[PDB]
mmCIF file of N, CA and C in Angstrom:
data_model
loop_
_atom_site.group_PDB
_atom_site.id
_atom_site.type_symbol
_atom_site.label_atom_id
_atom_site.label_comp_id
_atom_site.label_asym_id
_atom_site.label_seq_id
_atom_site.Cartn_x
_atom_site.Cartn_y
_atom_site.Cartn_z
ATOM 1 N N UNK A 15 165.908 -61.460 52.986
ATOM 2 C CA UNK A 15 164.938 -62.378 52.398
ATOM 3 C C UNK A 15 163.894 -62.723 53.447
ATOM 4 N N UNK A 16 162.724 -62.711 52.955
ATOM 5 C CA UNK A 16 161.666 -63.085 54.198
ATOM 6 C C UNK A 16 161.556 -64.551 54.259
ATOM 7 N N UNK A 17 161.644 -64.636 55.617
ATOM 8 C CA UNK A 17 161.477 -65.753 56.477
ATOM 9 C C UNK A 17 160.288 -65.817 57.105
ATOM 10 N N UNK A 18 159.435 -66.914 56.072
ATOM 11 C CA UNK A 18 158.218 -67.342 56.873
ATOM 12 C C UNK A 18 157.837 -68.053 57.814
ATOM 13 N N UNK A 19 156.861 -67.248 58.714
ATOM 14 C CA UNK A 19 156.345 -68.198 60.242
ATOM 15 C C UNK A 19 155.361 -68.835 59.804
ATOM 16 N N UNK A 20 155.430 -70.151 59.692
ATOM 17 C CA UNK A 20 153.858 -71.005 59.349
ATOM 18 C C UNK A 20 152.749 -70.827 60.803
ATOM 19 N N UNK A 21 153.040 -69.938 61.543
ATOM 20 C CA UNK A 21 151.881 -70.066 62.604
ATOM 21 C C UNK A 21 151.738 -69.030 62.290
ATOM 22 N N UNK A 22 152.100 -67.663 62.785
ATOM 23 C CA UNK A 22 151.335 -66.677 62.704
ATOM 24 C C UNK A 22 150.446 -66.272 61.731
ATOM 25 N N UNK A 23 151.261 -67.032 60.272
ATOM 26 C CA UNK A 23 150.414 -67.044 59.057
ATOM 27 C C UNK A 23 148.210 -67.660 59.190
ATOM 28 N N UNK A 24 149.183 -69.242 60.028
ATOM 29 C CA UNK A 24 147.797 -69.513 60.385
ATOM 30 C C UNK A 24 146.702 -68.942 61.370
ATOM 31 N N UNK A 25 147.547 -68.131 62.198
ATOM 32 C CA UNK A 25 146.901 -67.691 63.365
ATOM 33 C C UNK A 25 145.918 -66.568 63.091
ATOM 34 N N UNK A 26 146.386 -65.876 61.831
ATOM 35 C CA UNK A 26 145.270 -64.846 61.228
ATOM 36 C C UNK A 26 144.152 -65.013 60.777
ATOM 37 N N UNK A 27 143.878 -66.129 60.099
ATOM 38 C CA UNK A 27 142.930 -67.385 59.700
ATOM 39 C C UNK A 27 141.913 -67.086 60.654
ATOM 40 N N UNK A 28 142.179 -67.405 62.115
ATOM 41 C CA UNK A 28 140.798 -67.830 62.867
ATOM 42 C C UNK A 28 140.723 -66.365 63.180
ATOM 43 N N UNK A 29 141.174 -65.145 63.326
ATOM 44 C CA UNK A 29 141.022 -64.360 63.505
ATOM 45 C C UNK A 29 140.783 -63.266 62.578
ATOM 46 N N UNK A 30 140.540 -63.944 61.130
ATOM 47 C CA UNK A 30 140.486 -62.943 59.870
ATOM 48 C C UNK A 30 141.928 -62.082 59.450
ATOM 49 N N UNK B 12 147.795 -93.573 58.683
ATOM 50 C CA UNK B 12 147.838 -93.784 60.609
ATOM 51 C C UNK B 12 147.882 -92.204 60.740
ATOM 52 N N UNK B 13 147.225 -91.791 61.376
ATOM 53 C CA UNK B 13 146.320 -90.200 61.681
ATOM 54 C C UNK B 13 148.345 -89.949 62.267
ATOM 55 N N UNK B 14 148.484 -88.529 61.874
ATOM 56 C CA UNK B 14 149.508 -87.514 62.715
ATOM 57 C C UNK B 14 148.705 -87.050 63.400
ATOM 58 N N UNK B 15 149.075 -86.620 64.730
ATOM 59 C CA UNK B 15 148.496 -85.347 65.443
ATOM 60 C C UNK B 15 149.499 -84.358 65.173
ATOM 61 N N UNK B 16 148.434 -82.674 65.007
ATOM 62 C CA UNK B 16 149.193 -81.806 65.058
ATOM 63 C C UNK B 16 148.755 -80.700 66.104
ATOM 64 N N UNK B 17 149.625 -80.515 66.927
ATOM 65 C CA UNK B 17 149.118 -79.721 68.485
ATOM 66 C C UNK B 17 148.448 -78.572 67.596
ATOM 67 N N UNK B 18 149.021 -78.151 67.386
ATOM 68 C CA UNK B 18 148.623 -76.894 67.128
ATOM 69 C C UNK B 18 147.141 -76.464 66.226
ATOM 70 N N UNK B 19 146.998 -77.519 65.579
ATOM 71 C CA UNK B 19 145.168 -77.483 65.012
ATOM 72 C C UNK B 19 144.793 -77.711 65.919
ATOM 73 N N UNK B 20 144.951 -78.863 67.212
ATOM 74 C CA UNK B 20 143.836 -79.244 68.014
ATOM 75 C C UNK B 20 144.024 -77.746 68.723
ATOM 76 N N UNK B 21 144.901 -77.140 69.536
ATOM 77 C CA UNK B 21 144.587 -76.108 70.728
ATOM 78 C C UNK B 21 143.900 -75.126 69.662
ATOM 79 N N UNK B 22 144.401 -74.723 68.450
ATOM 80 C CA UNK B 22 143.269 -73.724 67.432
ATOM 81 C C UNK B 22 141.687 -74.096 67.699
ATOM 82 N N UNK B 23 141.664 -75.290 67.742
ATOM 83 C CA UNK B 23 140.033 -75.373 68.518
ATOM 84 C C UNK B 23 139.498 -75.314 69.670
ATOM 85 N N UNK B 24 140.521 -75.590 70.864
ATOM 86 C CA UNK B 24 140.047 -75.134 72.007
ATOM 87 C C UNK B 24 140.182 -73.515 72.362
ATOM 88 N N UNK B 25 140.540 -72.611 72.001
ATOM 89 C CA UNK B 25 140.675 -71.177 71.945
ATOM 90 C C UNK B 25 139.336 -70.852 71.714
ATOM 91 N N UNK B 26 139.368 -71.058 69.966
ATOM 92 C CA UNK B 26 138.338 -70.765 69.006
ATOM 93 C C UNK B 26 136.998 -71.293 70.264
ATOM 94 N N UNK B 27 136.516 -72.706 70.636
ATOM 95 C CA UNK B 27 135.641 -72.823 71.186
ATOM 96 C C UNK B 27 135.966 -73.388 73.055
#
């Protein structure tokens, strides 16, 4: 089952 | 009463 990282998720954000 | 959350503020010192 995937286990989500709430940062890396966000970290794509500032980086597209 | 404001949370701080580290991790938005350093997202702005990177970013700028």
């Amino acid at each position: 089952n995937t286990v989500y990282d709430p940062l890396q998720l966000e970290l794509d954000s500032f980086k597209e």
